[PDB]
Amino acid sequence: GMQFHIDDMTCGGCASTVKKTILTLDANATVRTDPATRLVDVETSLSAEQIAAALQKAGFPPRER
Ligand SMILES: [Au+]
Ligand SMILES: [Au+]
Numbered sequence: 001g002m003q004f005h006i007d008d009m010t011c012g013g014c015a016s017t018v019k020k021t022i023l024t025l026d027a028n029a030t031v032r033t034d035p036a037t038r039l040v041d042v043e044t045s046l047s048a049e050q051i052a053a054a055l056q057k058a059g060f061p062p063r064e065r
Contacts, residue, residue: 002048004040004062006055011035014060021058022051039065 009015015033018040022031029044040062042051048064055062 002042002044002051003065004042004048004052004055005065006038006040006060006062008060009033009035009038009040015040017058018055018060021054021060025051025054 006014006018009018012035015035018033019031022029022042022044026044026046029042029046032041033039044051052062052064
């Protein structure tokens with residue numbers, strides 16, 4: 001239960017891409033995105049830095065909360 005704020009995730013198509021990115025890295029992850037708040041909640045066995053690095057490479061640099 002890690003949370004990120006993703007300033008570039010401003011609508012639905014962005015969020016979809018964020019979610020697909022995470023699910024490709026860990027098919028067992030659960031991911032929630034809220035375009036109103038730009039917040040992304042992730043449950044995963046991977047580290048926050050591994051999730052962040054993947055999101056960065058995809059053009060959605062996060063900030064962990
Ligand atoms: Au978007
Ligand atoms: Au999910």
